[PDB]
Design an enzyme around this catalytic site. Structure first.
Site: not given
Ligand SMILES: [Cu+2]
Length: 181
Positions: A64, A92-94, A99, A108, A151, A154
């Site tokens: 991650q 966009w990305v935790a 996450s 995804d 997203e 996702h």
């Protein structure tokens, strides 16, 4: 209850969160509890001529971090300072620990490329995933609630009952959990 766990920037993964992982044929892993539901979802898409793949399931902490660092680097290359890039990448990305991918409850989903385009897969999922217990986790019209950008790849397992309610009332998971209490 178990499949309605909330993980986002204000709700980290609990400290000793146990998860048993099943390996898919592409080497990606998922929570073993969602396996037959994901299998049925994929079977149904293929019966409709739609050919998805799991691009990313379970991720470790370090994975991650790396995915996030890569997103930070992308923003740095487009003219963001390090601080600015970090904040924009979070949309966009935790950050690790926040996450859904670290639960094994999120996949995804992309198109295989050969038989289907991305947009055909994303459309099919939007319209059908709820019947298999999956929701479009981060829809374009809920960014002000989720904190996350559009997203369309996702998908999050919540179970058929919750997914169906969320679909028909046009909600995000946070709203659904708020209205459940
Ligand atoms: Cu994802």
């Amino acid at each position: 209850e178990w499949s309605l766990i909330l993980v986002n920037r204000q709700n980290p993964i609990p400290a000793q969160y146990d998860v048993e992982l099943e390996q898919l044929s592409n080497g990606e892993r998922i929570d073993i509890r969602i396996s037959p539901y994901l299998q049925d979802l994929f079977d149904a898409a293929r019966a409709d001529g739609v050919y998805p793949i799991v691009a990313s399931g379970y991720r470790t902490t370090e994975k991650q971090q790396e995915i996030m660092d890569e997103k930070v680097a992308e923003y740095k290359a487009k003219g963001y300072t390090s601080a600015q890039a970090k904040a924009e990448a979070e949309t966009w990305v935790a950050v690790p620990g926040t996450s859904e991918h670290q639960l094994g409850l999120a996949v995804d989903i992309n198109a295989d490329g050969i038989h289907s385009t991305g947009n055909e897969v994303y459309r099919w999922l939007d319209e059908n995933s709820y019947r298999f217990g999956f929701i479009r986790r981060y829809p374009p019209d809920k960014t002000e609630i989720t904190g996350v950008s559009n997203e369309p790849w996702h998908y999050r397992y919540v179970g058929i009952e919750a997914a169906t309610k969320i679909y028909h009332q046009g909600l995000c998971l946070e709203e659904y959990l708020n209205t459940e209490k």
